[PDB]
Amino acid sequence: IVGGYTCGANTVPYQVSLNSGYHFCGGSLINSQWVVSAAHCYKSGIQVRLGEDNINVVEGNEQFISASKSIVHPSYNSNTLNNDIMLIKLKSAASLNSRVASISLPTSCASAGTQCLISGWGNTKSSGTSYPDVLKCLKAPILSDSSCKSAYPGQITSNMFCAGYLEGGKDSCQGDSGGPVVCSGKLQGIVSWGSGCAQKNKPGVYTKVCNYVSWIKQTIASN
């Protein structure tokens, strides 16, 4: 997260870190057994780390649970990032309390102008590289479809939306991938892609979770 703030420990209780020997992506806990992330975060041997603040220090609220199975969206295209969503099942159910909690799925899509909270452990610099240990947060609005398409001609599908600031300076970034965009207590987006980070006229692009609720529910019901 570039141009954000320190969230505060366990203030974003649905935020998870995906670990394969190291943090590599965010994700969102959606029930005791299941995490939503980006398909571009797929790999084998994922451990899901819940209850994290400092990802390099055991601070007392962590739950580390290996994934039993990952399901990339059936229509994910890694070239275009269309359908950049993946479900991860935990081998055991997480213990839920106020520091580790699921986030609700949307019942309706969000509109441009809605304010959201984006979070993660990704790079905090727009030029060069600095990875934080503690969770970072950014409040940002959803942008109009027209501004999003104008920013990224030929690239924005109906399964994507832009959020952030066209002036630059405030965005998600590498290592935030897969993490949440939450608006009015609903998971509306997944950190997906963008050109660089926090660049002028190049906002963040996010998977439009409301399009996937049917798929998520039916997949959980049968897996």
54 is in an annotated binding site: yes
Q: What share of the chain is helix, strand, coil (3-state, %, to 5)?
A: 10, 35, 55
Known catalytic membership, residue 84 = yes
d(CA 191, CA 177): 5
Total residues interacting with Ca ion, rule: CB under 5 A:
3
**Residue whose pair of structure tokens reads 């209780």 in the numeric block:** 13
172 is in an annotated binding site: yes
Known catalytic membership, residue 40 = yes
Choice among 37, 119, 177, 192 that is catalytic:
177
Choice among 28, 70, 84, 119 that is catalytic:
84
Tokens of 209: 């979770």
Q: For Ca ion, which is the closer residue by CB, 59 or 145?
A: 59
Cβ neighbours of residue 26 under 8 Å, at least 6 residues apart? 15, 16, 17, 18, 37, 119, 120, 121, 122, 175, 176, 177, 178, 179, 180, 191
d(CA 208, CA 212): 8
177 is in an annotated binding site: yes
Q: For Ca ion, which is the closer residue by CB, 9 or 96?
A: 9
75 is in an annotated binding site: no
Q: For Ca ion, which is the closer residue by CB, 52 or 176?
A: 52
Shortest separation between residue 30's beta carbon and Ca ion, angstroms: 21
Shortest separation between residue 17's beta carbon and Ca ion, angstroms: 9
Shortest separation between residue 14's beta carbon and Ca ion, angstroms: 16
Site map 45..84 versus Ca ion, x via CB under 5 A: -------x-x----x-------------------------
Which residues make up the interface to Ca ion (CB under 5 A)?
Answer: 52, 54, 59
Binding annotation: 52, 54, 57, 62, 171-172, 174-175, 177
Binding annotation for substrate: 171-172, 174-175, 177
Catalytic residue set: 40, 84, 177
